Design an enzyme around this catalytic site. Sequence first.
Site, mmCIF file in Angstrom:
data_model
loop_
_atom_site.group_PDB
_atom_site.id
_atom_site.type_symbol
_atom_site.label_atom_id
_atom_site.label_comp_id
_atom_site.label_asym_id
_atom_site.label_seq_id
_atom_site.Cartn_x
_atom_site.Cartn_y
_atom_site.Cartn_z
ATOM 1 N N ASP A 96 40.074 24.981 10.682
ATOM 2 C CA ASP A 96 41.271 25.745 11.012
ATOM 3 C C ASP A 96 42.498 24.859 11.173
ATOM 4 O O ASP A 96 43.622 25.316 10.940
ATOM 5 C CB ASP A 96 41.027 26.549 12.284
ATOM 6 C CG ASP A 96 42.218 27.381 12.678
ATOM 7 O OD1 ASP A 96 42.601 28.262 11.879
ATOM 8 O OD2 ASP A 96 42.763 27.155 13.781
ATOM 9 N N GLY A 97 42.312 23.606 11.567
ATOM 10 C CA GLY A 97 43.462 22.738 11.774
ATOM 11 C C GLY A 97 44.296 23.207 12.948
ATOM 12 O O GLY A 97 43.789 23.399 14.061
ATOM 13 N N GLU A 128 36.558 24.398 14.227
ATOM 14 C CA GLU A 128 37.532 23.330 14.387
ATOM 15 C C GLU A 128 36.990 22.320 15.390
ATOM 16 O O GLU A 128 36.488 22.711 16.449
ATOM 17 C CB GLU A 128 38.863 23.940 14.846
ATOM 18 C CG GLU A 128 39.957 22.961 15.132
ATOM 19 C CD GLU A 128 40.081 21.931 14.058
ATOM 20 O OE1 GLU A 128 40.540 20.812 14.371
ATOM 21 O OE2 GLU A 128 39.702 22.217 12.909
ATOM 22 N N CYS A 167 40.230 16.588 2.540
ATOM 23 C CA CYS A 167 40.511 16.027 1.227
ATOM 24 C C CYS A 167 40.446 14.504 1.220
ATOM 25 O O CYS A 167 40.945 13.875 0.281
ATOM 26 C CB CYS A 167 41.886 16.493 0.748
ATOM 27 S SG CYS A 167 43.174 16.462 2.033
ATOM 28 N N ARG A 214 48.092 16.996 7.116
ATOM 29 C CA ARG A 214 46.940 17.619 6.482
ATOM 30 C C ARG A 214 46.989 19.143 6.526
ATOM 31 O O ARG A 214 46.032 19.802 6.102
ATOM 32 C CB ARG A 214 45.641 17.112 7.113
ATOM 33 C CG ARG A 214 45.522 17.307 8.611
ATOM 34 C CD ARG A 214 44.429 16.402 9.156
ATOM 35 N NE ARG A 214 44.168 16.614 10.576
ATOM 36 C CZ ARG A 214 43.381 15.831 11.307
ATOM 37 N NH1 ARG A 214 42.784 14.784 10.750
ATOM 38 N NH2 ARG A 214 43.179 16.099 12.592
ATOM 39 N N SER A 215 48.083 19.718 7.016
ATOM 40 C CA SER A 215 48.153 21.152 7.246
ATOM 41 C C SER A 215 48.536 21.892 5.965
ATOM 42 O O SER A 215 48.686 21.305 4.890
ATOM 43 C CB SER A 215 49.152 21.456 8.357
ATOM 44 O OG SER A 215 50.459 21.094 7.951
ATOM 45 N N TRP A 216 48.690 23.206 6.087
ATOM 46 C CA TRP A 216 49.150 24.058 5.001
ATOM 47 C C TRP A 216 50.652 24.280 5.110
ATOM 48 O O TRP A 216 51.219 24.292 6.205
ATOM 49 C CB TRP A 216 48.445 25.417 5.021
ATOM 50 C CG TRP A 216 47.015 25.398 4.592
ATOM 51 C CD1 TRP A 216 46.390 24.438 3.854
ATOM 52 C CD2 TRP A 216 46.025 26.397 4.874
ATOM 53 N NE1 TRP A 216 45.072 24.776 3.658
ATOM 54 C CE2 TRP A 216 44.823 25.973 4.276
ATOM 55 C CE3 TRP A 216 46.039 27.605 5.576
ATOM 56 C CZ2 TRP A 216 43.646 26.714 4.358
ATOM 57 C CZ3 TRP A 216 44.871 28.339 5.657
ATOM 58 C CH2 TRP A 216 43.691 27.892 5.051
HETATM 59 N N1 LIG Z 1 32.912 19.001 10.693
HETATM 60 C C1 LIG Z 1 33.982 19.766 10.873
HETATM 61 N N2 LIG Z 1 33.855 21.032 11.402
HETATM 62 C C2 LIG Z 1 34.974 21.816 11.585
HETATM 63 N N3 LIG Z 1 36.214 21.324 11.236
HETATM 64 C C3 LIG Z 1 36.351 20.081 10.701
HETATM 65 C C4 LIG Z 1 35.233 19.284 10.525
HETATM 66 N N4 LIG Z 1 35.640 18.111 9.999
HETATM 67 C C5 LIG Z 1 36.987 18.131 9.854
HETATM 68 N N5 LIG Z 1 37.444 19.350 10.281
HETATM 69 C C6 LIG Z 1 38.850 19.811 10.303
HETATM 70 O O1 LIG Z 1 39.583 19.614 9.115
HETATM 71 C C7 LIG Z 1 40.934 19.791 9.470
HETATM 72 C C8 LIG Z 1 41.887 19.442 8.341
HETATM 73 S S1 LIG Z 1 41.785 20.630 6.985
HETATM 74 C C9 LIG Z 1 43.487 21.216 7.240
HETATM 75 C C10 LIG Z 1 43.632 22.278 8.326
HETATM 76 C C11 LIG Z 1 44.394 23.533 7.911
HETATM 77 N N6 LIG Z 1 44.627 23.539 6.473
HETATM 78 C C12 LIG Z 1 45.715 23.645 8.670
HETATM 79 O O2 LIG Z 1 46.348 24.702 8.679
HETATM 80 O O3 LIG Z 1 46.192 22.700 9.290
HETATM 81 C C13 LIG Z 1 41.029 18.804 10.617
HETATM 82 O O4 LIG Z 1 42.044 19.147 11.529
HETATM 83 C C14 LIG Z 1 39.678 18.981 11.286
HETATM 84 O O5 LIG Z 1 39.796 19.605 12.536
#
Ligand SMILES: Nc1ncnc2c1ncn2[C@@H]1O[C@H](CSCC[C@H](N)C(=O)O)[C@@H](O)[C@H]1O
EC number: 2.1.1.37
Lengths: 277, 277, 179, 179
Positions: free
Chosen positions: B12-13, B35, B81, B256-258
């Site tokens: 979820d970020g 998350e 990513c 790293r967000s959207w």
């Molecule tokens: N094993 C895991 N289980 C759940 N979340 C994970 C994880 N490993 C990494 N993440 C999540 O991957 C997230 C980045 S993906 C980007 C988050 C989203 N697109 C946004 O709106 O910001 C990181 O913040 C982290 O919390």
Amino acid sequence: RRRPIRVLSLFDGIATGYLVLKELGIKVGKYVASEVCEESIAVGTVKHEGNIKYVNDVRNITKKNIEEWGPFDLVIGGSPCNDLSNVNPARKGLYEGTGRLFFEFYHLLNYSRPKEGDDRPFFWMFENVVAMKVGDKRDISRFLECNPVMIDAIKVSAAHRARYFWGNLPGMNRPVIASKNDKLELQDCLEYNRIAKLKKVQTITTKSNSQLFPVVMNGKEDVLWCTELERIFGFPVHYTDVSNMGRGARQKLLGRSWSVPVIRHLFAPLKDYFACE
Amino acid sequence: RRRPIRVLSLFDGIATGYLVLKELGIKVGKYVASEVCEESIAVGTVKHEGNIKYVNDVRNITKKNIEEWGPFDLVIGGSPCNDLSNVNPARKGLYEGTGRLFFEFYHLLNYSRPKEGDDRPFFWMFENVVAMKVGDKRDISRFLECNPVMIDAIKVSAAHRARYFWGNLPGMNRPVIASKNDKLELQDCLEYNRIAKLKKVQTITTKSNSQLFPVVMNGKEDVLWCTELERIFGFPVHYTDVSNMGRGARQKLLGRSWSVPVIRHLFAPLKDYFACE
Amino acid sequence: MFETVPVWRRQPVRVLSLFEDIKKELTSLGFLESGSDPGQLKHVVDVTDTVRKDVEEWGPFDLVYGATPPLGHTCDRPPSWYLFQFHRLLQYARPKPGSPRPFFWMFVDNLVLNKEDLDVASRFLEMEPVTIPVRVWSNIPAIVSEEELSLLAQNKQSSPTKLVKNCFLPLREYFKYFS
Amino acid sequence: MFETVPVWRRQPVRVLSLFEDIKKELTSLGFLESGSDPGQLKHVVDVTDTVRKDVEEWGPFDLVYGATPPLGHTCDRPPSWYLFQFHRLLQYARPKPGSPRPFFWMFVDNLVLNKEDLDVASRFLEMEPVTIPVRVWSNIPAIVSEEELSLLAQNKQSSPTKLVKNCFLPLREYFKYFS
Ligand SMILES: Nc1ncnc2c1ncn2[C@@H]1O[C@H](CSCC[C@H](N)C(=O)O)[C@@H](O)[C@H]1O
Ligand SMILES: Nc1ncnc2c1ncn2[C@@H]1O[C@H](CSCC[C@H](N)C(=O)O)[C@@H](O)[C@H]1O
């Protein structure tokens, strides 16, 4: 009639004076701030959109500057308390180090004062800590030619902050009463899902030790956040979210600042002397 | 008729999904977020006041959990990513390191899907970067059984952010048009007394080196502030002013967000399928 | 569990062998026909471009078999690749929820999945592997400590076992028998 | 500048000598009156509790004198203390804006002010100090490098100069002579 207030703020910090005057609805005609902290200037510049004329060091303000920038209706200021507090062992007193900066306020105060024949309204106020030697409190009273009133922010906020206030503002000695929207307990200043251990907070300063773990979150103790510090002092939320300042930088500015509801109490009688919106 | 939306958000970020759904006026009935980043969870908890049910690691979500927490109307997610981008030299691909987390989305997607014969509306979306090798983009398309849509945030924001979007959302392939309140140039995202050199900014990531000095203040070069990064990504101001996070911590979450205006474009057709405010 | 079938109703099973062919192996019991040149067994090894329609177009399946490459072999692809592709193709071969029918699946590992992959394998296949001195994930009816397996894996690493047939015994109770 | 006065109008100065008494000094030129037991000179040394009303009742005054203690001696108070107190008492003794009567002030330091303190002294007294081989800040119409001055200061500090009399000469053009 009534016209906007022209203010000279020495040692402006994060522009608490301009903030309180606008929160009171007073029309601020001119706000000249003497301020040298880069991060502090960035705050008063961004959060007030360039309505504050910064003049940098107070020791570079000449007598011609007070005449040109003048006239002034309000002269406020609080000299640094590093060399005036009983906490710091390596003091330099009122006459060395940064303690000698009080006389710069005394100097520019007499420069800004109206002449004897000019009966125009003129107000001023000086702030400093109570934890000063009686010899330094006496000398400040000897130079400002008046006596200070002690106002603790615990009466109107959620933290201890006993400070001395010299000045000729109307009704400085009046009883301090808390307003309706004042966050008087620590739980009122907290964020969501965070629990406050105490009702009030020990006097907050620039250092991290301002107990040291006064909040519980997810059944675990944690320190106060910057947003919560701003609520304790009465500043708006994210008032210090400026210039990439971290936790330590924002606490430094807040630790040296004024309690906003206290200055609101002091500046309130000015509404009947200048224009308002 | 129309009913509030029940959303499952993996990875979820900083809760961009919940933010966009509420900004669209959609009634959010249930938002289950997987998350693990403490600082990220603190954001979605404080900025949304506990409306988000956090379930921590995605690899601990059992089949019974999807049944109990369900039913779900929307399943969104974007796997990390780090091991899928051409930027990092030490890749571990889609099958080692953090790349294998995509299959956790594929796993929970089929668990949350309605069975055959259930004609109830069900939408989903997976996001990842474009700078991935063709061998992994094909495999992701082979598992999600569809083809991705490329949407660059340059059309609707002030930054490059080309990302791939798998999913069955209505009209994902439609032309992206910018809304009225979108700040599409850097000067729109800046603060007061801040001057932008460029019209758009190079793709922002977790590291500070993202040109490196794109703003001028008081005739001197300076980096972007945290508040300005939030405006670039479309998040509200001070959205990351949480948990005493410094400059590096807030840029990590934002990098790293959207892109919020991009996700708004994708989630907009959901307004005609669920309840609204 | 499924219910047993009368012997006169049982029909030859059609199996999908992935990665490792068991046609020569499955003949030992007689589930397939020795004369049938097409055979009931469909064997694929590279499935990167196999679509759901491909499995549907190949016809129904009753047993889906997947197996990691033998130990004494190089790793052309990551060990997790075979499990994820097995899981993807398995969901294609399952009968629709509207039409129930006997359906079985098996995934066997020849000590090629590491500790990290075993947790993923058990989570995706929804069961802990049972040790047969290979590891077996299957919905078939019925079916030494690691210390020994870890040291054995090192000796084996320095230098195509088919003992899994014993797990196929109750599948004759659902399909026919050849002699 | 102040305009000179006819000799028959001139009257004896009444002076305020702070810290360092110059009663015996002023007799040498004759600004003071030999014999006047209620002297025109008012001398105070400790002014920490002096109020504006005290100076007003001691007034009026025409010349205000302040001086740091002589070299060596003691650091009873910081060297800046005398300048700040001199500036505070001077504003008490100044004539009101509705009186253009002659008023003079002088502050002299015997190389006791530090480098930073000179900048404060010049800012408060509104003029750069002139060097007489002591430094004098004054509005009297009357009016070598630092290394030698500093090294000489170090020698004497390791181990009551009254040469300022020559600066009082143009005060004779506004006040009496041997009176
Ligand atoms: N094993 C895991 N289980 C759940 N979340 C994970 C994880 N490993 C990494 N993440 C999540 O991957 C997230 C980045 S993906 C980007 C988050 C989203 N697109 C946004 O709106 O910001 C990181 O913040 C982290 O919390
Ligand atoms: N020489 C100098 N000239 C002008 N300001 C000075 C100064 N030396 C210190 N300061 C100021 O003293 C400030 C602290 S005094 C507290 C500021 C004020 N009470 C407020 O509302 O925040 C510091 O921020 C610094 O900028």
